[PDB]
Amino acid sequence: EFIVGGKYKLVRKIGSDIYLAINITNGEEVAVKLESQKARHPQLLYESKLYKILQGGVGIPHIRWYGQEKDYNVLVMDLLGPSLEDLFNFCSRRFTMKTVLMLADQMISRIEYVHTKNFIHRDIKPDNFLMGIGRHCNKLFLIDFGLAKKYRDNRTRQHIPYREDKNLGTARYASINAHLGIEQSRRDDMESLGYVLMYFNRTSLPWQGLKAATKKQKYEKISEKKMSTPVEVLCKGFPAEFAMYLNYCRGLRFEEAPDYMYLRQLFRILFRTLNHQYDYTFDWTMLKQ
Amino acid sequence: SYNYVVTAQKPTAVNGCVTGHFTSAEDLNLLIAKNTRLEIYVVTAEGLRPVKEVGMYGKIAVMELFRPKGESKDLLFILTAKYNACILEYKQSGESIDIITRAHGNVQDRIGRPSETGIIGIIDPECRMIGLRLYDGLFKVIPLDRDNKELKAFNIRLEELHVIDVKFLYQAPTICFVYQDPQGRHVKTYEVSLREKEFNKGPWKQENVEAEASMVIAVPEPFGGAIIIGQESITYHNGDKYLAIAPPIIKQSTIVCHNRVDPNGSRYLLGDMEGRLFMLLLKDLRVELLGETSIAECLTYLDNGVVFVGSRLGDSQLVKLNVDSNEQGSYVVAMETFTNLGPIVDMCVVDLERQGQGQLVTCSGAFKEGSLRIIRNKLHIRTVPLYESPRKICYQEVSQCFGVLSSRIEVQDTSGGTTALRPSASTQALSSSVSSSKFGEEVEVHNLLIIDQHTFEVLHAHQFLQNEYALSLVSCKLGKDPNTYFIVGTAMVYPEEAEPKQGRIVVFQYSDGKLQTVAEKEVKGAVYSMVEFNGKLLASINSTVRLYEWTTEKELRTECNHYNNIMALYLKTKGDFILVGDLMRSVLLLAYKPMEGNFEEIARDFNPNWMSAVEILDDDNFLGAENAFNLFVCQKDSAATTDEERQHLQEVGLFHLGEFVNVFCHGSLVMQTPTQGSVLFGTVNGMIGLVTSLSESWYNLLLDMQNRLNKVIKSVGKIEHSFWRSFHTERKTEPATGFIDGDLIESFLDISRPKMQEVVANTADDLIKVVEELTRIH
Amino acid sequence: INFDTSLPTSHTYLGADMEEFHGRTLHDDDSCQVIPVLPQVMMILIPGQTLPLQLFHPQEVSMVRNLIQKDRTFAVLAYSNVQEREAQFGTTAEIYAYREEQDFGIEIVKVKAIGRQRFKVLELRTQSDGIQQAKVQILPECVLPSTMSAVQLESLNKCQIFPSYKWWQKYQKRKFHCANLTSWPRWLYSLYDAETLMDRIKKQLREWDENLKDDSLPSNPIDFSYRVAACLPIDDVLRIQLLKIGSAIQRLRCELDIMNKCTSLCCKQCQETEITTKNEIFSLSLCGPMAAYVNPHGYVHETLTVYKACNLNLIGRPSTEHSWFPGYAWTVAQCKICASHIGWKFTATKKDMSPQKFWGLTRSALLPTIPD
Ligand SMILES: O=C1CC[C@H](N2Cc3cc(Nc4noc5ccccc45)ccc3C2=O)C(=O)N1
Ligand SMILES: [Zn+2]
Secondary structure, three states, rough: OOOOOEEEEEEEEEOOEEEEEEEEEOOOOOEEEEEEEEOOOOOHHHHHHHHHOOOOOOOOOOOEEEEOOOEEEEEEOOOOOEHHEEEEEEEEOOOOOOHHHHHHHHHHHHHHHHHOOEEEOOOOHHHHHOOOOOOHOOEEEOOOHHEEEOOOOOOOOOOOOOOOOOOOOHHOOOOOOHHOOOOOOHHHHHHHHHHHHHHHHHOOOOOOOOOOOOOOHHHHHHHHHHOOOOOOOOOOOOOHHHHHHHHHHHHOOOOOOOOOOHHHHHHHHHHHHHHOOOOOOOOHHHHOO | EEEEEEEEEEEOOEEEEEOOOOOOOOOOOEEEEEEOOOEEEEEEOOOEEEEEEEOOOOOEEEEEOOOOOOOOOEEEEEEEEEEEEEEEEEEEEEOEEEEEEEEEEEEEOOOEOOOOOOOOEEEEOOOEEEOOOOOOOOEEEEEEEOOOOOOOEEEEOOOOOEEEEEEEEEOEEEEEEEOOOOOOEEEEEEEEEEOOOOOEEEEOOOOOOOOOEEEEEEEEEOOEEEEEEOOOEEEEEEOOOOOEEEEEOOOOEEOOOEEEOOOOOEEEEEEEOEEEEEOOOOOOOOOEEEEEEEOOOHHHHHHHHEEEEEOOOEEEEEEEEOOOOOOOOOOEEEEEEEOOOOOOOEEEEEOOOOOOEEEEEEEEEEHHHHHEEEEEEEOOOEEEEEEOOEEEOOOOOHHHHEEEEEEEEEOOOOOOOOEEEOOOOOOOOOOOEEOOOOOEEEEEEEEEEEEEOOOEEEEEEEEEEOEEEEEEEEEEEEOOOOOOEEEEEEOOOOOOOOOOOEEEEEEEEEEOOHHHEEEEEEEOOOOEEHHHEEEEEEEEOOOEEEEEEEOOOOEEEEEEEEOOOOOOOEEEEEEEEEOOOOOOOOOOEEEEEOOOOOOOOOOEEEEOEEEEEEEOOOOOEEEEEEEEOEEEEEOOOOOOHHHHHHOOOHHHHEEEEOOOOOEEEEOOOOOOOOOOOEEEEEEEOOOEEEEEEEEEHHHHHHHHHHHHHHHHHHOOOOOOOHHOOOOOOOOOEEEOEEEOOOOOHHHHHHHHOHHHHHOOOOOOOHHHHHHHHHHHHO | OOOOOOHHOOOOOOOOOOEEEOOOOOOOOOOOOEEEEEOOOOOOOOOEEEEEEEEEHHHHHHHHHHHHOOOOEEEEEEEEEEOOOEEEEEEEEEEEEEEEEEOOOEEEEEEEEEEEEEEEEEEEOOOOOOOOEEEEEEEOOOOOOOHHHOOOOOOHHOOOOOOOOHHHHHHHHHHHHHHHHOOHHHHHHHHHHHHHHHHHHHHHHHHHHOOOOOOOOOOOHHHHHHHHHHOOOOOOHHHHHEEEEEEEHHHHHHHHHHHHHOOOOEOOOOOOEEEEEEHHHHEEEEEEEEEEOOOOOOOEEEEEEEEEOEEEEEEEEEEEHHHHHOOOEEEEEEEOOOOEEEEEEHHHHHHOOOEEEEEEEEHHEEEEEOOO
């Protein structure tokens, strides 16, 4: 019998560690992230700290309660919908061009909001983008801020120094430079988002089925397989704009702010060219019709 | 605490009168009941001969004569309001007169709801039983035997729960009455079995009667049966027999009293709510309008065309009827008039003539019996008739006149408008004025009368707005203004609205016979009260208590407000202290904080009981009148160590007055001492009483003297003096505290010298000096 | 309109029919008594009110057991502050329905109590077991005779027995005819008349419920006044004041004042965010517009029903469990500014039901407001 915070009974595990919980005062369902005290890789106290900063922007989930219960650190938060990786699987590993372009728009803005509050996500992958529930079922939430790093001071806006020699995460969507041990900035979030888009466009990436015994070996193929494949090759047979986006991100200087209006315009104009409406009818909405 | 209350003028209203043979089998008597007072008269050819006047320790709620078998003369049954019952007898031996108690007891039930149509006492024609309807659903029967000296009684269950009127009919003791139910109103009969202790089926079937039946009349033999009187009809039900009549002469007003002229029930006297006097005269039934008397509470034919009219609202009359002498019409002529100060709905004390001895001027009576009365020290009363109802009165020395609010009834017109019913003081002024405005149904019209203090003529009459109701009157100076003004606070009253949402405070001035509206301020509710407060005007508008300043622009400017829990019906003020009240005894104390310009509640006391008036005795004491005719005193302790005690008012005086007070008044009627202070009050029966404070020493002394006096003085009906004066409501009865019955102390001067010695047995002449000093206060 | 008003008062959601008692316990008025206090209860219990309960902790279950054997009555404290643990007044609750259940091995007891008698707290004492017993003084119930019965002319007593706008005008002119002898008008005596006050309140209840006034509504002013007191969505400091009142004439009078002055119902935490208005209040239960209900884990919510709310955001999706109003579902509702919980939204389940959507608001999250 696990009631967290005085009010949240944990019904079941809905992710792994994300748990459905129910508030015993009202009946409201919430999500509870359980992290062991004296765990190997502690982040919950960090995430609870970032969520206080990011509170207020659209697509950022509300925190109910952080604290300790029994042996654990507890994060009680909004219950969201499926992830984009969940919904990809629902659609049989295939998104239309409309669903990518619509998803491109919200995804760009989510990453932008975090960038404004002075942090880089460093974990841009479909698993961390989630639709909401109920009134928020067309809204996209960017979550899991365990890997989020400050990149500039809040008042002086001075950027973090250029380093090399850091450890990359999810190799699949990392940037070229972040494999090369170069320190990450806003550009590397943008370049990441772009791989996520192409991975919707083609059922897989050119560096996806590269197997090797150890994780160091898994990364090494992918990192140089990516360096081997031109952005034109990767986006071939898809609209020019996708290649223009990736060329832009990798065109950025370390400290240099991305032009979010330009990146959102590329797909918004393309969305217009393809004679689509932004009617929040995604591929998955059709399968439920 | 420890106050002394004493009667200044006994009650004058007549709430009942009977005729019979009570002092002698040969004499004809007129017995009059004035609340606590019983008056006995011998009916001579000349007039009425006063024979004996007794006081009772109770409010006479029933008074009937009856002559059982074996008695030489009638006996008198009396039931007081507190349910003391009794039978009395007149015994005289030479010069000594005594009212001896033949039987007595209290008939109250531990459980029961007081009936809607009131107490009803009836006595069987054969003197077999006394029937009482004290509570709904029960009929109490006291059996008339020699061996019932305790007046023991049993109840019979009464299915008809809404009984209007009931009389014993003229073989078995039969009652006929009228009940009200969804079906309608009906007339029914029951026999009463003393042996069975229940009801049996009555002689004649239940008949469906008029939906306004309010009065039952038992016709004696040879006619028998009963007469049921309603708003439109007068029917005669005697078993099977029926003779209904619906005369238009009676349709105008409801008939409220009746009297059997002829012993065989041939002709009856009828009187309505408006003073008309009728004659009711079995094959045929008919009515005749005889003339106009005072509004009758009770009628009683005496002999040789003379009648006594007892008047609760107005003055009591002996009138001569000329029913015979058929050359001239039936006409009523007033032989004698007896003063009735009641109801006193307001009064004031003015030093009119002697400039040392105060004079009491009241608003008294209602409707056509409305009048002023000027009372000065055996009391002397001068009756200024008004033919409409006075409601407030105040004096204005500067303009040597009185300001009086009043009200008259007018009926809606066919033309669109209203027509008065008779001339009245507001319509016969020498100068008049009306406020600037913005079917047959009664409409109430309110005026400000201006009245010469010397002649008592109606110099000016100002009429107020349509549907405006005048509530408060003041005479005073305000601000830096040398002028003195009449200020009337009003309320707009429409039948659809339930609480007053508009009102006015109107500043008049009386100069050179001309009354002018100096200023008018409109407020958002009823102005229940106003008082002059240290050069400002303190006006209560519903639950707000507001303070006004008189600008040099001759305007009222709001200085502060104070919103209370309660509606501010009563206002009073001593110093910077204010006493706020409401109809439910909710007392409040405020104090004006001049350094802050606002009000600050000092204390309160909420004990739910209906409250009729309040008055500031001293800085620490407040005197009130509260439900079931009681007086009380509340007290403040500004010294107390805790703030929970210092904002609490302690109940320090409880007294069963026996009268319904309407106004308290600081002042005296004597030439301006063991007593401190003087509060005069007036009541619904027209009683005037005097309230004044004592010392703990003088209180304790008189208190011992009361108990002794109670051991020696013979109470008519053997009613205990402690029981009578005990604080009374239907829920609680507590013994009286903090009050000295000055009417009992003063009765010492009337007890016999041997009895005086018995009381003084710790010197009787030493006590007579104390009592005589105490008679010098009124 | 198309859902049984009787289903919510049955409290069928609690489960199978409970054991019912028929007896009654009433301490004689003004009597000092010590009565135990259920530790977790926070409600300010008006008399004549049903309080559902589900007790889980072992100390609570034991305490109900003793009561079902003794006089069955516990003390419900009206708290000035809960954390202060201070209370000046409260009400006796008599248990009249119970059921014991052994769920997942743990003993559980479900109770329906009813408020009986107002009291003044003389002393509170927590015993060595953690359960606290209350020194209490039973506050009497004030009944006043008619206003003018005393000043009634015995001859004029006839006016009293009396036969809608034309009827109340004749009622006021006859029952209050003897105001001619007193200094106050007849219409002011009707501002203190129980039957006149109640008929003014019945006019406001019919605006909330289509139910005929005749049967549902009690004739006795004391029972009528307490029934109305229970269904007013006011705040606790007001209700503690209303409880302090002993006279129905005043209780009925402070009730009409509240129903006319306060027209807006705003979030208590914001004080300024408007949630709904008295125009939207409506009765979907027999006991009135507002009733007391228990959540599966024992929390008890006083749930006022309104057709329309605003400034509420829904959280989650409709659920059909524990539906205090069966045939309806619920979506937890938060205040749009402070995110405090305000109540639940009820959404029908069969299209034939009416109303198809309604709202249920928990009194403790509201604040009655006077406009301007
Ligand atoms: O009509 C209404 C409005 C809503 C209101 N509810 C319903 C409810 C259910 C609940 N369920 C559960 N908590 O933990 C659980 C673990 C497993 C399975 C179920 C649960 C917790 C609280 C409440 C509450 O407040 C009510 O009782 N009635
Ligand atoms: Zn809020």
